[PDB]
Amino acid sequence: MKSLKGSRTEKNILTAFAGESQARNRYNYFGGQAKKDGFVQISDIFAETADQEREHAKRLFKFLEGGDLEIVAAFPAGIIADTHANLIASAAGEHHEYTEMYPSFARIAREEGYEEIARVFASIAVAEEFHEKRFLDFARNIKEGRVFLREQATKWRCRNCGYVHEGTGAPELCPACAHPKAHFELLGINW
Amino acid sequence: MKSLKGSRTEKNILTAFAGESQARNRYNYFGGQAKKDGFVQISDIFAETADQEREHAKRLFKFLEGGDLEIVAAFPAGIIADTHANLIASAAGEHHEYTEMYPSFARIAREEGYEEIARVFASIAVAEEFHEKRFLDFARNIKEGRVFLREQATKWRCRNCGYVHEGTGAPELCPACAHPKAHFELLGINW
Ligand SMILES: [Fe+3]
Ligand SMILES: [Fe+3]
Ligand SMILES: [Fe+3]
Ligand SMILES: [Fe+3]
Ligand SMILES: [Zn+2]
Ligand SMILES: [Zn+2]
């Protein structure tokens, strides 16, 4: 470290901040479309990813010490589509970020004496890979019609009321809260 | 209207989207700092303004029909300070936006045959003026020490539990929910 002011890293941070800020918005918009599309678990993961982008941007933004600063950079100009498409566009952009943008940025940060920032750019990359992974599995189940249907009987959980259900597919309506299949997910345990 | 692709308006929308996306983040960060600073009513108004920026950005973003698109533009590189400073930086940026950026953008939109977009840029400007107004009155009370103290006895409301209190100043603790003065605001009626 030292001072960012005038460095290339300084513009890289702002550019990342600008792209991650926009990603938060798009993921929130993508989450609202997934809810409309009937994918509540996917809606909440967009919303979760949005929130996690907010936190990536926050860490970066706190690096800056400065005033206004001009950046040249390209950004998706649109667009909000169907959920599958939203998930793939999201995946693609996460992809460029972790395979391209952040590795470079990291490099230069490193290569300007900003190794902490360097670490942070690499660390966010990790998150972005998982984000990608996640978006892709979900796109694939949507593609393979396996969101609400699996080939062996398994357990599904109602996200709305916690009702658990044994079967190959989620129910068309929660016996407990009477919410529709959209609220069902594969029951998972991570503790 | 017609098609945005290649227009100057197209880059203006993305640039606005990019600046408004960043504003959402900064206002959310500014809201978290106001909560820490002991200004809960001001925290929630940052959060409210953040949310309203999300909605300005959403309307704009929905205009785009496109792919990647390069923009040159300047953005605050930082910073998160004390609440007063956050409120003034916010005011300044809202100021530039409604007096400068959006009037121009509107003009060109107009002047490219995009009059609906034109209307939207002018309409957002209105919101941004109120946003400014709001931030400025709050900065002024913080400046004049009148956040939690007024010169005549008046009524204060606990934002946490609704408890209402008659006095020149808010109480140091809510008699009802036992939360601190930070949660108090001037009682208001807008219905
Ligand atoms: Fe990500
Ligand atoms: Fe249920
Ligand atoms: Fe505003
Ligand atoms: Fe109270
Ligand atoms: Zn991110
Ligand atoms: Zn706005």
Swiss-Prot record, chains A, B:
PROSITE patterns: FERRITIN_LIKE, RUBREDOXIN_LIKE. Keywords: Cytoplasm, Electron transport, Iron, Metal-binding, Transport, Zinc. GO terms for molecular function: iron ion binding; oxidoreductase activity. Binds 3 Fe(3+) ions per subunit. Disulfide bonds: none annotated. It comes from the Bacteria. It is found in: Cytoplasm. Its main location: cytoplasm. The keyword Iron applies. Fe(3+) 1 binds at E20, E53, E97, E128. GO terms for cellular component: cytoplasm. Fe(3+) 2 binds at E53, E94, E128, H131. Its cofactor is Fe(3+). Fe(3+) 3 binds at C158, C161, C174, C177. Residues 153-191 form the Rubredoxin-like domain. Residues 1-146 form the Ferritin-like diiron domain. CDD domains: rubredoxin_SM (cd00729), Rubrerythrin (cd01041). May provide oxidative stress protection via catalytic reduction of intracellular hydrogen peroxide. Homodimer. Possesses two rubredoxin-like centers and two non-sulfur oxo-bridged di-iron centers per dimer. This is Rubrerythrin. It comes from Nitratidesulfovibrio vulgaris (strain ATCC 29579 / DSM 644 / CCUG 34227 / NCIMB 8303 / VKM B-1760 / Hildenborough). The lineage of its organism: Bacteria, Pseudomonadati, Thermodesulfobacteriota, Desulfovibrionia, Desulfovibrionales. The gene is rbr.
